[PDB]
Design a protein around this ligand. Structure first.
Ligand SMILES: Nc1nc2c(ncn2[C@@H]2O[C@H](COP(=O)(O)OP(=O)(O)OP(=O)(O)O)[C@@H](O)[C@H]2O)c(=O)[nH]1
Ligand SMILES: Nc1nc2c(ncn2[C@@H]2O[C@H](COP(=O)(O)OP(=O)(O)OP(=O)(O)O)[C@@H](O)[C@H]2O)c(=O)[nH]1
Ligand SMILES: [Mg+2]
Length: 175
């Protein structure tokens, strides 16, 4: 649970290719928006942050959306403590891919109450095909938070990662 007395949280960002998981992560870690698309195999970042007064060590795993790197899933799902399940609000297919990740996480962790947050990214764009209410209704049925983000403008970026931390904390305080 702790590293040098700081509370450790192992966050994993998952979702289809091109949804913005790297841009989100890099916005949180480095406070800059990546405009280019450099597909990820698997990257990781640590960040010391205060969340609700608690000094946390975040270990954020930035995973592959491209199917060619699927063999790496089982390993990150075993070690991850909470999952940001990311789709893009202009990509219907990405929204339809959410439960591919969710069900795989549940299967690997053999658990129905794994901490997760649904993230609808690219909320800056005009061309929305996935509505707020539609994604909200899904997250409600899952019993998880839903947050709209823009890696470009920073809207909701902290909220997405910090909500996940709060959910893990609540899951842990239960036990
Ligand atoms: N307008 C806008 N573009 C975004 C946003 N987030 C990401 N992008 C762009 O979308 C493209 C892909 O973003 P990435 O973060 O590389 O995507 P990814 O989900 O990490 O992709 P994989 O690593 O292949 O799974 C890039 O060109 C980003 O600049 C956002 O919030 N708004
Ligand atoms: N966790 C998980 N994700 C999966 C699985 N199969 C596919 N995916 C994800 O979903 C994507 C493919 O789903 P779609 O967006 O419908 O794509 P598609 O039509 O099958 O193929 P393309 O459009 O060519 O990418 C992959 O790139 C992965 O990100 C699976 O078994 N488990
Ligand atoms: Mg990436």
């Amino acid at each position: 649970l702790y590293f040098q007395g700081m509370t450790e949280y192992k966050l994993v960002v998952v979702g289809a290719g091109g949804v913005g998981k790297s841009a989100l992560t890099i916005q949180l870690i480095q406070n800059h928006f990546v405009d280019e698309y450099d597909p990820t195999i698997e990257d990781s970042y640590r960040k010391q942050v205060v969340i609700d007064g608690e000094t946390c060590l975040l270990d954020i795993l930035d995973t592959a959306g491209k199917e060619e790197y699927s063999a790496m899933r089982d390993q990150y799902m075993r070690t991850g403590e909470g999952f940001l399940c990311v789709f893009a609000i202009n990509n219907s297919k990405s929204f339809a891919d959410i439960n591919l990740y969710r069900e795989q996480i549940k299967r690997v962790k053999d658990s129905d109450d794994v901490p997760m947050v649904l993230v609808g990214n690219k909320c800056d764009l005009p061309t929305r095909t996935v509505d707020t209410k539609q994604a909200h209704e899904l997250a409600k049925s899952y019993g998880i938070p839903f947050i709209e983000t823009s890696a470009k403008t920073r809207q909701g970026v902290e909220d997405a990662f910090y909500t996940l931390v709060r959910e893990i904390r609540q899951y842990r305080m239960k036990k």
